[PDB]
Design a protein around this motif. Structure first.
Motif, PDB file in Angstrom:
ATOM      1  N   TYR A  21     -32.282 -31.482  -0.849  1.00 48.52           N
ATOM      2  CA  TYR A  21     -33.063 -30.743  -0.960  1.00 48.52           C
ATOM      3  C   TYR A  21     -34.693 -30.751  -0.489  1.00 48.52           C
ATOM      4  CZ  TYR A  21     -29.845 -27.738  -3.478  1.00 48.52           C
ATOM      5  OH  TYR A  21     -29.245 -27.126  -4.205  1.00 48.52           O
ATOM      6  N   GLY A  59     -25.821 -24.333 -14.997  1.00 51.94           N
ATOM      7  CA  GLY A  59     -25.689 -25.848 -14.375  1.00 51.94           C
ATOM      8  C   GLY A  59     -26.209 -25.799 -13.207  1.00 51.94           C
ATOM      9  N   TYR A  65     -34.948 -24.261  -6.874  1.00 54.07           N
ATOM     10  CA  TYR A  65     -34.633 -23.198  -5.438  1.00 54.07           C
ATOM     11  C   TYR A  65     -33.988 -22.316  -5.842  1.00 54.07           C
ATOM     12  CZ  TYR A  65     -29.669 -24.481  -5.007  1.00 54.07           C
ATOM     13  OH  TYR A  65     -28.486 -24.240  -4.606  1.00 54.07           O
ATOM     14  N   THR A  83     -25.994 -32.377 -17.621  1.00 55.03           N
ATOM     15  CA  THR A  83     -26.863 -33.748 -17.883  1.00 55.03           C
ATOM     16  C   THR A  83     -27.863 -33.921 -18.615  1.00 55.03           C
ATOM     17  OG1 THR A  83     -25.509 -33.814 -15.550  1.00 55.03           O
ATOM     18  CG2 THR A  83     -26.879 -36.154 -16.021  1.00 55.03           C
ATOM     19  N   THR A 159     -25.456 -21.791  -9.279  1.00 52.08           N
ATOM     20  CA  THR A 159     -25.356 -22.388  -7.917  1.00 52.08           C
ATOM     21  C   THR A 159     -24.911 -23.687  -8.333  1.00 52.08           C
ATOM     22  OG1 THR A 159     -27.905 -22.905  -8.301  1.00 52.08           O
ATOM     23  CG2 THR A 159     -27.289 -20.567  -7.180  1.00 52.08           C
TER      24      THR A 159
HETATM   25  N1  LIG Z   1     -18.930 -29.121 -17.542  1.00 57.85           N
HETATM   26  C1  LIG Z   1     -20.144 -28.801 -16.680  1.00 57.85           C
HETATM   27  N2  LIG Z   1     -21.068 -27.906 -17.632  1.00 57.85           N
HETATM   28  C2  LIG Z   1     -22.250 -27.691 -17.301  1.00 57.85           C
HETATM   29  N3  LIG Z   1     -22.461 -28.354 -16.291  1.00 57.85           N
HETATM   30  C3  LIG Z   1     -21.985 -29.308 -15.786  1.00 57.85           C
HETATM   31  C4  LIG Z   1     -21.013 -28.902 -16.008  1.00 57.85           C
HETATM   32  N4  LIG Z   1     -20.277 -29.698 -15.237  1.00 57.85           N
HETATM   33  C5  LIG Z   1     -20.427 -30.760 -13.955  1.00 57.85           C
HETATM   34  N5  LIG Z   1     -21.952 -30.200 -14.842  1.00 57.85           N
HETATM   35  C6  LIG Z   1     -23.315 -29.406 -13.339  1.00 57.85           C
HETATM   36  O1  LIG Z   1     -23.064 -29.037 -12.150  1.00 57.85           O
HETATM   37  C7  LIG Z   1     -24.178 -29.686 -10.988  1.00 57.85           C
HETATM   38  C8  LIG Z   1     -23.479 -29.768 -10.361  1.00 57.85           C
HETATM   39  S1  LIG Z   1     -24.488 -29.712  -8.162  1.00 57.85           S
HETATM   40  C9  LIG Z   1     -25.376 -28.291  -8.805  1.00 57.85           C
HETATM   41  C10 LIG Z   1     -26.685 -28.450  -9.284  1.00 57.85           C
HETATM   42  C11 LIG Z   1     -27.448 -26.964  -8.609  1.00 57.85           C
HETATM   43  N6  LIG Z   1     -27.690 -25.843  -9.467  1.00 57.85           N
HETATM   44  C12 LIG Z   1     -27.506 -26.886  -7.209  1.00 57.85           C
HETATM   45  O2  LIG Z   1     -27.891 -25.452  -7.132  1.00 57.85           O
HETATM   46  O3  LIG Z   1     -28.332 -27.906  -6.380  1.00 57.85           O
HETATM   47  C13 LIG Z   1     -24.340 -30.996 -11.583  1.00 57.85           C
HETATM   48  O4  LIG Z   1     -25.891 -31.148 -12.086  1.00 57.85           O
HETATM   49  C14 LIG Z   1     -24.220 -31.201 -13.526  1.00 57.85           C
HETATM   50  O5  LIG Z   1     -24.092 -31.709 -14.765  1.00 57.85           O
END
Ligand SMILES: Nc1ncnc2c1ncn2[C@@H]1O[C@H](CSCC[C@H](N)C(=O)O)[C@@H](O)[C@H]1O
Length: 257
Positions: A21, A59, A65, A83, A159
């Motif tokens: 990003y 998530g 963004y 997390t 996303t």
């Molecule tokens: N079991 C779960 N429940 C909710 N979120 C989770 C998860 N396992 C992984 N994730 C989350 O999924 C993400 C994947 S990276 C995606 C991040 C962001 N929405 C983007 O568009 O870039 C991480 O932030 C991770 O913490």
């Protein structure tokens, strides 16, 4: 394969943000996917019938963004992640703390997409005010938000999350059902994810991904109980050092009345 607990110790928000990003002169393939995501999110949130009061981003990671166009259509946003360190990263940006990631070049790009009708700081101020809570979430759980007391949402956004969070297709369908409990009848589901991706890299850290093709994504969402209103396949791959995806998708689904 990658357990949710591995996120807690091994997911590096800042490494993730720089790789994916940063809008640099390096990371071109990542930059091109980001431009395409922003264009599709612009169409979804600004050019259609996807509007309402409360949007819940599931998530979110350490990123905003995916909310830049959405805040023009939803006046209340909840961001959530599994997390804790991703949440601190969002909190930094929300509260304008030193060390917050610089979203300037992405904000400018979105303001452009949207006709340069506002400046970057106005957009930022709007998004910041819209973010009502920052919450822990777990998509695998029957109550993804830990039964925090909320009204039914008008929109769920997710996303690049569900593919990462789900070890197989029944788990994917279950996550979609769990999420559905947060959404009002008639509510919107907006999703973006990689297609046929089995992993993504953060530096040397490898994270697993459920490899799904577009037909399967569409079937799974319909089988998870939604109706599909919009669907796009994005012909772009991440860097060879980043992922083995074969495109991405964006979709808009609707929970029945
Ligand atoms: N079991 C779960 N429940 C909710 N979120 C989770 C998860 N396992 C992984 N994730 C989350 O999924 C993400 C994947 S990276 C995606 C991040 C962001 N929405 C983007 O568009 O870039 C991480 O932030 C991770 O913490």
């Amino acid at each position: 394969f990658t357990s949710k607990d591995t996120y807690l110790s091994h997911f590096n928000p800042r490494d993730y943000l720089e790789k994916y990003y940063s809008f640099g002169s390096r990371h071109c393939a990542e930059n091109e996917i980001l431009r395409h995501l922003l264009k599709n999110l612009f169409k979804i949130f600004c050019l259609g019938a996807v509007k309402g009061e409360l949007l819940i981003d599931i998530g979110s990671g350490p990123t905003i963004y995916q909310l830049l166009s959405a805040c023009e259509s939803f006046t209340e946003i909840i961001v959530s992640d599994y997390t804790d360190q991703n949440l601190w990263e969002l909190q930094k940006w929300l509260k304008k703390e030193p060390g917050a990631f610089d979203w300037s070049p992405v904000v400018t790009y979105v303001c452009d997409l949207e006709g340069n009708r506002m400046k970057g700081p106005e957009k930022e101020e709007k998004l910041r005010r819209a973010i009502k809570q920052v919450l822990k979430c777990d998509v695998t759980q029957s109550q993804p938000l830990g039964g925090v007391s909320l009204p039914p949402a008008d929109c769920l956004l997710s996303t690049l999350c569900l593919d990462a969070a789900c070890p197989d297709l029944p788990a994917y369908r279950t996550a979609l059902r769990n999420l559905g409990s947060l959404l009002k009848p008639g509510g919107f589901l907006v999703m973006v994810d990689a297609l046929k991706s089995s992993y993504y890299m953060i530096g040397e850290q490898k994270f697993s991904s459920l490899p799904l093709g577009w037909e399967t994504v569409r079937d799974a969402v319909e089988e998870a109980g939604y109706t599909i209103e919009q669907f796009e396949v994005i012909s772009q791959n991440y860097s060879s050092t980043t992922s083995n995806n074969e495109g991405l998708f964006s979709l808009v689904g609707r929970k029945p009345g």
